[PDB]
Amino acid sequence: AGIAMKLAKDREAAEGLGSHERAIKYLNQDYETLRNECLEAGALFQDPSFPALPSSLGFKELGPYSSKTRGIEWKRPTEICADPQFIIGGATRTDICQGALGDSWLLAAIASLTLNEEILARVVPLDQSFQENYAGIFHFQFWQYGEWVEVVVDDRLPTKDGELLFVHSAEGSEFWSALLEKAYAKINGCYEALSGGATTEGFEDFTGGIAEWYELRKPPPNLFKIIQKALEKGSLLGCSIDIGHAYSVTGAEEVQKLIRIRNPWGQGEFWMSFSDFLRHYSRLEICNLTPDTLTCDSYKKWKLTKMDGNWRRGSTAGGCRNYPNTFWMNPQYLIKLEEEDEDDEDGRGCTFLVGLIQKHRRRQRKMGEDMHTIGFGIYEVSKNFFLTERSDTFINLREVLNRFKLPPGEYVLVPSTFEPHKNGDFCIRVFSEKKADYQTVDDEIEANIEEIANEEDIGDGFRRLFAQLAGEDAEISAFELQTILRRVLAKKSDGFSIETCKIMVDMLDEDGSGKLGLKEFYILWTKIQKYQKIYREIDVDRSGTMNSYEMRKALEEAGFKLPCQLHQVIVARFADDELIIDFDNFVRCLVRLEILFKIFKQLDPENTGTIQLDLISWLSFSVL
Amino acid sequence: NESEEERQFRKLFVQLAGDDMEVSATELMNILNKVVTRHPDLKTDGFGIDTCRSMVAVMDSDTTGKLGFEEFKYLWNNIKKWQGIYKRFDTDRSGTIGSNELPGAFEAAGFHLNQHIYSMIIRRYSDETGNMDFDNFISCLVRLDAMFRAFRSLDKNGTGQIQVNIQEWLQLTMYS
């Protein structure tokens, strides 16, 4: 737990963790290590994390107590056929099919991996079998909202009367498909979770690319060009007639206009006029591969960029022009298009794809559910003020994708939720014809605090009343401080908390005594006046408080500019429910923020941006 | 799996956030103060909102100000252990623990520092007499634990040291 977990993860990613070649280990299980253990102990692996029981099946439609789970016996392949195979090479077709349970969109998404070896390896390790180092364990690699995750599973498949209840080969001999589906269900919590799935998500999760989909009854223009250019990039195209067989587009020529269709279930193809294609099928799905996906010499690939961000209630969750008061607060990104797309017919511009996929949330029980209504706007050209070329398109899909061709230049991307105030995370990707440049557009870290110069001045009364208050040591304590200020501010918010006062002292001490002198009390009083002003000028409606969203404003007035993450940190930690930040917390944060900078500066003499601490020193500064 | 004190707790969660299974800092407060403060063998008004917010903060790596249930179980556990310890030292059941015994208290807690850190910790978390109450004792342990862990987290290989940039630092110390 703790942001230190996230901070370690980020570090790992920055060095490859999450890339296809160094996939994140799901639930920390390591395939080899687990395999080898089952060998030494001469046993057949059994997954602790995803056991062969009802919970791995469902919780409602397929939950225990339900008469659909009654009769299921988990069995391994070796016990369902006399020489089960992982995969049979030399295939010219596939015979995958479902069981009584198990969704159909899976046939489509899985069948598509049979057309290209290289695309199948990526998601299905080839050095596996029921013969060699077998021990009842198989791993697979899935793409998850940006990064790759390796998953493990024991080969126990659910059956009911000697018949797989899900995805399996017709000849009942191969098993990689049945396993790949088992794994996919694991990383999704359960088989029932797959019920509300969609081929576009499967396509993505199985390959790591971006998927454009088109309802043929409203095709975009130059579709044929899109198809032809996709095929050239080795993209995966699939079409169908929906209201049940999934075909794929494997050729497109002008000689008239023709597109070749292939049935992964036949070994055969056939051509047809582009005209008939547009009238027979009702859906075209294009899975655009990332540039690393294929190695076949020149297949021409896209240029990819990807960033991450989030929306947090109270600081960064505004989104959608319709809410001008908060819209400019969402995270913001910048795209730089240079070289345009080459000639052919239509005018000019730079083609690129943009997708915003919302990451997984705790309450997502099944695929496709409790999804936020997302979308993003684009603008032609620090963190941009409320003074902010397409936008629109706001549906509740785990991903929103828009295709564009624009004149070379710089544009500003503003991902967001439809309504403001909603927590969620996300990843944005840009696929483009030519090299494009991404860049976050945000405030860099900055602290410019006003250094008051107490000195002589300081009144007669002030000095006198102090002495008659400081006692024998001419200094006061954080406790005495509380009471002194309570009386003063009593005459907005009604009193500073004792933690606020203690940090004040830790800041202004410097005399290393746990107490503040006369000059030190003077400076505090001065800073306390500033805070009171700023807070006042923000509370334009004299309500006695401030709202979480005004904090960015206020911080800037106090000499601070921070990135979106730190603004989230601040509102999460100091604002109460109903996003209100009272005056005590208001200054608590400012004092704390200042002391934290001063400390960093002290521990970083060379001014390098990074400090090296040991365990004992670390505890001292982390909590004192 | 889990236990009887937890499921009873899981209960309060479900009712509060269904499948979200997260808690606010003020929700956390109400829960724990229905449990720790209500017993004759422990003098305490319970934990305060600031104490709770810090608990959520050090335990929440998503920046949502919400405490997750798995995280809450971990926390509770620590709170029960440190609860036992506080009783072992609040001799007269005065409500606090004397300034001289505390060092041994934090050591009974597994946190071995030096007389200077306590002469920093005590001075930082005690009342004006120099003594700490249940609220603050726990509050201070939550953070000591939080920062011990963060250090381990950023020191993968076990080098007795960690390096951090201004950004990592402000997050580590601001959210706590």
Asked if the Cβ–Cβ distance from A573 to B53 is below 8 Å, we say: yes
* Cβ contact, residue pair A612, B161, below 8 Å: yes
Nearby residues of A441 by Cβ (< 8 Å), 6 or more positions away? A332, A333, A334, A382, A383, A384, A412
Strands A409-417 and A374-380: what pairing? Answer: antiparallel
Number of neighbouring beta carbons within 10 Å of residue A110: 25
Sheet containing strand A236-240, strands side by side: A210-215, A283-288, A236-240, A247-254, A257-262, A269-273
Find out whether A447 and A560 touch, Cβ atoms under 8 Å. yes
- Please tell me the total count of domains within chain B: 1
Rounded Cα gap, residues A381 and A124, in angstroms? 44
* Closest C-alpha among A352, A342, A339 to residue A378: A352
Residue B42's CATH number: 1.10.238.10
Residues 6+ apart with CB under 8 A from A569: A3, B63, B170, B171, B174, B175
Residue B14 touches partner A, C-beta closer than 8 Å: no
Superfamily holding A209-300 = Cysteine proteinases (3.90.70.10)
Any idea how long chain A is?
624
CA distances from A104 to A107, A109, A392 (A): 5, 9, 32
Expressed as residue numbers, the domain containing B73 is 1-176
Q: How far apart are CA A248 and CA A116, in angstroms?
A: 12
Chain A nearest C-alpha distance from B97 (Å): 19
Task: Tell me how far apart the alpha carbons of residues A201 and A211 are, in angstroms, rounded to a whole number.
Answer: 8
Q: Angle, nearest 10°, between helix axes A564-574 and B166-174?
A: 10
Find chain B residues with C-beta within 8 A of A17's C-beta.
none
> How far apart, in whole angstroms, are the C-alpha atoms of residue A379 and residue A150?
38
Tokens representing residue A244 in the block? 């049940």
| Cα–Cα distance measured from residue A68 to residue A152, given in angstroms and rounded to the nearest whole number | 26
CATH fold of A458-624: Recoverin; domain 1 (1.10.238)
The runs of H, that is alpha helices, within A364-513 are: 460-470, 478-490, 498-508
CA–CA distance, A193 with A364 (Å, rounded to integer): 9
Nearby residues of B37 by Cβ (< 8 Å), 6 or more positions away? B44, B45, B46
B94 labeled binding residue: yes
Determine whether the interchain pair A573/B153 forms a contact, defined as Cβ–Cβ distance below 8 Å.
no
B155 annotated to bind ligand: no
Q: Is B116 exposed, middle or buried (0-12, 13-18, 19+ CB in 10 A)?
A: exposed
Please count the helices (runs of H) and the strands (runs of E) in chain A: 17, 28
3-state secondary structure of A27: helix
How many Å lie between the alpha carbon of A209 and the closest alpha carbon of chain B? 26
CA atoms within 13 A on the CB side of A461: 0
State the Cα–Cα distance between residues A120 and A142, nearest whole angstrom. 11
Strands (E), A100-224: 137-144, 147-154, 157-159, 168-169, 210-215
Residues B47/B140, Cβ–Cβ less than 8 Å: no
Q: Which of A66-72's residues contact partners 24+ apart within 8 Å by CB, and which partners? A: A68/A101, A71/A160, A71/A161, A72/A158, A72/A159, A72/A160, A72/A165
How are strands ordered across the β-sheet holding A350-358?
A: A303-311, A424-432, A350-358, A399-406
- Burial class of residue A416, CB neighbours in 10 A (0-12, 13-18, 19+): buried
* A68: amino acid identity, one letter: K
> In angstroms, what CA-CA distances link A187 with A42, A56, A466, A581?
27, 11, 66, 39
Q: What is the DSSP letter of A136?
A: S
Convert A236-289 into a string of H (helix), E (strand) and C (coil). EEEEECCCCCCEEEEEEEECCEEEEEECCCCCCEEEEEHHHHHHHCCEEEEEEC
Task: Tell me if A573 and B163 make a contact (CB, 8 A cut-off).
Answer: no
Please, which residues have CB within 8 angstroms of residue A98's CB and are 6 or more apart in sequence? A104, A106, A107, A166, A167, A168
CB contact under 8 A, B153 and A566: no
Q: Determine the Cα angle at A568 with ends A410 and A621, to 5°.
A: 120
The residues, any chain, with a CB within 8 Å of residue A379's CB and separated by 6 or more, are: A388, A389, A411, A412, A414
Cα distance between residue B48 and residue A211, in whole Å: 50
In angstroms, rounded to a whole number, what is the distance separating the alpha carbons of residues B132 and B97?
Answer: 6
Class of domain A301-434: mainly beta
The residue in chain A having the minimum alpha-carbon distance to the alpha carbon of residue B129 is: A479
**CA dihedral (A35, A39, A45, A47) positive or negative:** negative
| Rounded Cα distance, A193 and A178, in Å | 16
Question: What residue type is assigned to position B149 of the chain?
Answer: R
Three-state DSSP class for residue A66 = coil
Q: Mutation test of the interface with chain A: which of B170, B175, B176, choosing the one with the most A Cβ atoms within 10 A?
A: B170
CB contact under 8 A, A1 and B64: no
Q: Locate the domains of chain A by residue range.
A: 1-208, 209-300, 301-434, 458-624
Q: How many residues does chain B have?
A: 176
Q: What tokens were used for A411?
A: 């544009």
- Tokens 């400390």 correspond to what residue? A599
What resolution (Å)?
A: 2.6
**A246 token code pair:** 């999934």
